[PDB]
Amino acid sequence: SRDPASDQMQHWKEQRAAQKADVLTTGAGNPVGDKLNVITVGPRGPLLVQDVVFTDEMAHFDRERIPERVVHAKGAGAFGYFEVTHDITKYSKAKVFEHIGKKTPIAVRFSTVAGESGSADTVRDPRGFAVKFYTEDGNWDLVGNNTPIFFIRDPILFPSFIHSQKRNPQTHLKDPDMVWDFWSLRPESLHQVSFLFSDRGIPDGHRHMNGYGSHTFKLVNANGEAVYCKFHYKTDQGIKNLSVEDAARLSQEDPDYGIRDLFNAIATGKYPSWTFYIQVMTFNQAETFPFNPFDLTKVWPHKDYPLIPVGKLVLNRNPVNYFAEVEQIAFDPSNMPPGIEASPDKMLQGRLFAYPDTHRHRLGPNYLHIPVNCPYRARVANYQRDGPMCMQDNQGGAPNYYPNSFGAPEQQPSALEHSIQYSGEVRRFNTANDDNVTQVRAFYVNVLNEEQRKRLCENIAGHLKDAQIFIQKKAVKNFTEVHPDYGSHIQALLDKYNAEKP
Amino acid sequence: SRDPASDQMQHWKEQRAAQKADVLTTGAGNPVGDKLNVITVGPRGPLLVQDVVFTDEMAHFDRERIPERVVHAKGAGAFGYFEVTHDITKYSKAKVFEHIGKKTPIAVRFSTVAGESGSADTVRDPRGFAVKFYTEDGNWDLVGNNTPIFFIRDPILFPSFIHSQKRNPQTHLKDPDMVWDFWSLRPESLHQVSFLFSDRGIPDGHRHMNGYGSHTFKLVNANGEAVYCKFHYKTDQGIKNLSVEDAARLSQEDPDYGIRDLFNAIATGKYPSWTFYIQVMTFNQAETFPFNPFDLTKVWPHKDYPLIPVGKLVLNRNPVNYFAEVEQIAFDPSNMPPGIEASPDKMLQGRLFAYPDTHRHRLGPNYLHIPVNCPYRARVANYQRDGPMCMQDNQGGAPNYYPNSFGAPEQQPSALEHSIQYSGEVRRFNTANDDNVTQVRAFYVNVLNEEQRKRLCENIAGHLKDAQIFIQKKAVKNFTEVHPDYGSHIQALLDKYNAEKP
Amino acid sequence: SRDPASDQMQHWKEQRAAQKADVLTTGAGNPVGDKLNVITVGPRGPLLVQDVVFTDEMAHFDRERIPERVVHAKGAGAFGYFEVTHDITKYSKAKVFEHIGKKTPIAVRFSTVAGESGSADTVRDPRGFAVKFYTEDGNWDLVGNNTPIFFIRDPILFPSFIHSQKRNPQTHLKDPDMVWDFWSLRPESLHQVSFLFSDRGIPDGHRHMNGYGSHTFKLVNANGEAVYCKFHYKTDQGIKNLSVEDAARLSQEDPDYGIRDLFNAIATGKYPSWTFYIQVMTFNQAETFPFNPFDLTKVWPHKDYPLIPVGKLVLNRNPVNYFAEVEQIAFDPSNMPPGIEASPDKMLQGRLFAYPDTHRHRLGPNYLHIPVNCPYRARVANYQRDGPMCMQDNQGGAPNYYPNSFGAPEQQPSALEHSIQYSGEVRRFNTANDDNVTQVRAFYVNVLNEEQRKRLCENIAGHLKDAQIFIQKKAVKNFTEVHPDYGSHIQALLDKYNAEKP
Amino acid sequence: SRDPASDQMQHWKEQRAAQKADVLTTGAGNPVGDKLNVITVGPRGPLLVQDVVFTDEMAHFDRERIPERVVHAKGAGAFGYFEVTHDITKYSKAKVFEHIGKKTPIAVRFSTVAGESGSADTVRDPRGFAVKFYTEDGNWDLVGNNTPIFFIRDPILFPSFIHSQKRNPQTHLKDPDMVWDFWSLRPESLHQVSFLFSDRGIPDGHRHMNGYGSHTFKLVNANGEAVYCKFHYKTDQGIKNLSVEDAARLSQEDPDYGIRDLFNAIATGKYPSWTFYIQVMTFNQAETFPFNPFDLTKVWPHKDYPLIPVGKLVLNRNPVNYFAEVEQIAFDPSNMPPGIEASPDKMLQGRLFAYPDTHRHRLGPNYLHIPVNCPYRARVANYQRDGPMCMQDNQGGAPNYYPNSFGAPEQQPSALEHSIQYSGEVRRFNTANDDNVTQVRAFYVNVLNEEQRKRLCENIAGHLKDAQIFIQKKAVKNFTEVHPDYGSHIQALLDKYNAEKP
């Protein structure tokens, strides 16, 4: 007997036990006489079109692949639940938080950002940590990262950032000129680059990392009073990281290290959990916060904004079929039940558009009817009809226009959004030159010890050495602005690497 | 109170009765506060992206349309059952025919050929009569016409024939030059052109027409003995046709006459039925038949091949949602359970390829999981996986390769096809100059009376008058070959029409 | 010799003249030996898969259809040019208007709203009049109607409105209960319903109707000063309408009357033109306008806002292939060159999202590379890459991220949009009960004469008679509010029709 | 200065030189004022829908990914030419071979089989070597492997084989139980498994490997006389292989080793070439060949069937954009000009169906209009029309039906295929138990030396150790049948590995 992942098929055979083999059928349920040989004109003659068994099977095989996710392509999934452990009903009317001990089913997908489908798990990258909550007020998708921040603060740059992080358009190779030209020109990236190149850039599987909502959200209570919040989900298995050397070894030996680790943990009963916290900031505190509190390159310091415990995420179930439950899952940040709303974080606003949009491409217009995406603890009743691969009854003969005088679904006034006044011109405002160094300096100095600063600078120099000198110089300039020692230590290591380079 | 079709919504309201209106939700089940107004910056300001209710709804609306069927676009559907009334188990082992009184659920779609989605029902055209039988040996699709024959005997010409029957590629108009140039050059069309331009070219709705399989099929019994057959399903409501004048009036007043007539009949309990017959021909009779018995331009005369009664089709149920059940239905002639097989009819062989192929385009690779297409009285178990819009469980964790040593589905030797030896070179054989007049002459002379011959010639001349003279001459030449009176009477009427034309 | 439309193929043959027939090829350019017969095992044997000529052709035929447009499905197209005839450079910096005599190529598509692909042209409906201007500042799409107004003033209701105007979801029939329930509940529709049921509801082909932008747009001049405007394009062939009786006759005799009329006019040199006008309103006038000047249910009265002449549209070219140039054309109201901008018309704002969104579905992500959609008088240079059916060079090896230090395209500050301040809360504002009768009354009383009022009431009653009584009563109530005579005359005719109804 | 691949962007900048930066535009060519910041209601307010620059860019980014190839996903491409160096016109009338010195442009894609898009190049796998020849008789696609044989001899098993070679459906991991269960049950795999696990299983980049057509093809000369042939294209850079240890190191250090190696070779002028040979067998020799000569698990021994030189493939051009030219390229084995035909190799027959079928999914129905797929040295003239993303003119107003009397393209009798008679029943014939060991034994004994046999057995045992014991036993049984030493040496190493396993 091996690890549970290696025994997948043996275990499936054993559950079947004395049951006779099912009859092998075509797509349309017609029994198949022989699926080992094709129909031919005698033993050395050509193939006949009336071999429809062959064509049915081959045509399906031809269309097995769907587009990979534009980002976060390489993933591992699991199911379990969220349990409420404290009352936060003062902050939010959301039914997910309604009373202590209320259990909500969840789906999670862990992912890297830049690697395509086949790529190694144990590489330096931000990790996605997406959580779908199947609530009675429909699904809530909290589509998180393993970092509280991101590289950019304006959503128009996200395609550019991803292009720089992927392959050269001509050579189809990873290109450090591209990666570091983009970062050196966008120094709002310094904060997330510092975290990325620290130890937690390569977690030891998905079980040993935190997740964050990263954005500011707005919570609204039953009285219509609003606060801003951050979501944090801190690992109960404890933070653990791979060394660069072990990460490299695993990249070759086990490209799917993350998938295997998580599948095995759940199959052997070692159920990974995370404690779900909020930080809360009031609307008055948001006016007086030294930075933009909706700036995705900034954290809220813990002293001023302590973590308020809410609940626990537990993963206790493996996906039965990976394609059905993990390839096809779709998380939309716009799927927010009443009591949770978008802040004016520019980056979050961009994400409200982008995700349904890509889901309709990658999966299809009716992707929300795919069972993993279905809000199966709500009744969906609306005026949407038709579209390819329309499943169930398409809401039967119900009137398909609103308003109507025929008792078809009605809007629910309690579900109406929180109202705010905003001051200023409707125009494009420049954020680039915000305050991109202050909190990065706090991280370098007050969070990292001396050993960690040394590895941070060795990890940066090891990547940045492959850029052209003019890029290296602009990169080092930005690191210098964070802290003289940060810049100088990077420059020192680059001088060594550029001298060894013939 | 009006006809049942006009009272669709009132009846739906009444069934709901005292029930409170459902809550109006987004696609993801989140309740909607207000779906009458969009979120704006003050009363005369611009629209916000965080209006996701608006974007969810609009984006769905944008993708409501799917490709129309390449042919047979305009359709009406119904459900009911097939009941066996006689034993034909001597001819076929098919479970659909297994014992007297065995009921099988059916789905039917009636259609014209050339009209696009919006077009009028009451036009001169062949009518489709497609029947899906949901058997325990999977679905059987008998994809029939309202005529026993077709215009062509080789499947390579089918796209050409349809192009000639549709719109000019530049003008986007119906083009009689195109229609009649194609027919005048392909005189195998004479038989189906004669039927088309007779009275039964415009049936009085779908209830007053026969359906035919048209092709020769091969029936195989439990001993492995094969016969050839034709399927006929003769209307129990009796044949009835619209006059050209009434057809024209209805085309303007009620473009959806066929849909309305059938929906109303079923809603008022007047359940239309058809008696299902076979003609049988043995393999020896097929050797000695004066024509090719697999020639789709030929009938089997009733004296030599009498109709053997089998069962009854009854339509007793309206579709609940037209898009779900009629737009999305897909019939594949290749879906044949054991005991029914393809003959070597060249046209049928072509159809075994074409239909799954177009279904994967029009609907999607997993179109057989759409509930109307699902073989819900069989267990589907196979090695097909994934593909966009994968529904249910994708067969769970079952081994996905065959052969395997893990008890995954097994081929069933009893379902193996009937074996035949064929003599000759593998090459392209010319059929054009077969015997394209003999059975047409039998129809003109022995089936039609004098009144019917006169209308046939008036109906042809009325269409053919719009072709160029050289086309008219080649058309009349082919009609002359059927019978001198056929050609002469057409020429006479054309001379009148061409003189009135300035 | 017939009309030019009827002689399409003869003319094509004649242009070819002495040229030998091209060689018939597969999709991949391989010459075809015989495309009249399929490869079979002897003359009465089955079809072989190695007949790839057959499968290549059939598979293409299977995928000929694309989704029809969700609205405006049935269309006729033409090409020509726009010529500037007056200086409006004081109002707009747009290069389309740059100097007198400047010619810009155009594409136009005329359409009904509700009819599907096959449907009759000569029916009562609003007509689309879409104009694509191929300018040197890229394409400008002015996607107009044959009416200055529309039925609704908030874009969230557009899917609902279209559903009510199309087929019942169960019966698949047109449903007057649906049509009039929606209008009776949304009395902002009264203005467009009055125009629709007047004489200009059924124009005599596309040449005898006006087009309007309908929305308020914002013009910006080279000094950065903004005005609001309306676009009007008035027919130079003069307004002409079909009677209800002639419309009905043509619906049966010539379903494609509009397509034929326009194709023939252009082929015989009778080039239809429209005079292109603007109305201008200043930002101060917009503050003091008695209604919302961005309300799509309102006109700007001509006395207060006179038509300023700008140029002339001339259509002088037929599409060479209808599918290439008319089915595949895509117009995006968001395609506005510098100097033309969106107003805060809520309906226009909705349209900025919806059209690219549906185009990516109907045509594909790279639909702007389809030659009719290509901005062929601009160089397209951007950071967009890949996507299915990527044509040309995908911008070669150019850096694909922005900002970059490698001389890839740069933003152009002169193209930056006009800035405005807006006052108010970000919330959903109710518009329903605006002023929905005042301008309708002006139309009924001051524009229509007595004969026209009588036909208006006969046309309404003739449609509305088929609704249930409670709907009829709410409809008449809203007409009464416009004018007592309007309501009373409709009620009188309904009493007659409801008495004749058994 | 680095390798040319690393200097891609610097070289692109330098070619541009003094040229001013292009203007950054939308998709529709409208100039962009600012693409660094989004439009917001004041500096901390929400995002507006009228930011169409943002939505245009984001929506495109959302749809960048297309489905990866179902097999051979990970690829490197290049262009160059084929030159004829000897006369083979006695064997084939194909215009590619027409006279000595005739140059034909080519496109090549090298690939692994099982790895997805992101995966490492330097892994043990068969390599694809696909060649598209752009001839004047259209494109010829010779879609080859780096081995003369394959694992299976019947095309119905190809989906099963690929499933076993890819990821477990539940765990999404590579599964040795799956790999070796399939091979141990299908011992026709022994020949290709022996080659795969020898040294040439991991070539040193794409330049140091042979390509083979693998199938028997049929050549037809101008007199209509047919022979059978194999195509071989032997590397002129010489065979060179990576050790298992170096392959593992490169898999981690340079996942894209193959892409980089080939791009650099071509950019530095070191143009890789292959000598193109045929083996010829006459129809009489095919009757007397000891095996099935159309059996894809068999070679033709070189003594009996010597290599006849034909020409040279030279690769001298890098793709300008990888997505345009390598992701979107499509090779169809069915694209054969006159003079080259399919043999009755069952596996080739299957491939005639599968490839166009998958191309229409992965790329689109009009994928042959993508410039890399376009047969640009032939005029394509046919009756195919429409389909999504129809480019060029859709063949203008040419008649779209055949036959016609309007001078539209005509079939070319010289292009008609070679005719053969075949003897036997049309049924499913069992091939499994053919002669699966004889030629494998010849390879083990006569081709491999002692060192190579030892590595072969170490390479097999190193993979097969991870299977369950019952699979290991059935695998070893099949290896024993090839040669007692083959089986015994594998069993010995497995006993060592299974003892170390706790």
Residue numbers in the entry:
A (entry chain A), B (entry chain A), C (entry chain A), D (entry chain A): 4 to 505
Quote the paper.
To investigate the performance of the microscope in practical biological structure determination, we chose eleven macromolecular specimens with different sizes and symmetries to show that the capabilities of the instrument span the full range of molecular structures for which the single-particle cryoEM method is ideally suited. We determined eleven structures, with three having four identical molecular subunits, three having twelve identical subunits, and one structure each having 1, 5, 6, 24, and 60 subunits. When compared to the range of atomic structures determined by cryoEM in the PDB in recent years, we can therefore conclude that the system overall works well for nearly all specimens amenable to single-particle cryoEM. It is notable that all the structures were obtained with a single day of data collection where the number of one megapixel images in each case was between 350 and 500, equivalent to 20-30 images from the current generation of 16-megapixel direct electron detectors in use at 300 keV. The resolutions were all sufficient to build accurate atomic models (2.6–4.5 Å), and a majority of the structures (7 of 11) extended to beyond physical Nyquist resolution, indicating the power and importance of combined detector and optical performance.
Two of the others were essentially at Nyquist resolution (catalase and glutamine synthetase at 3.4 Å), with only PaaZ and the 70S ribosome at 0.9 Nyquist.
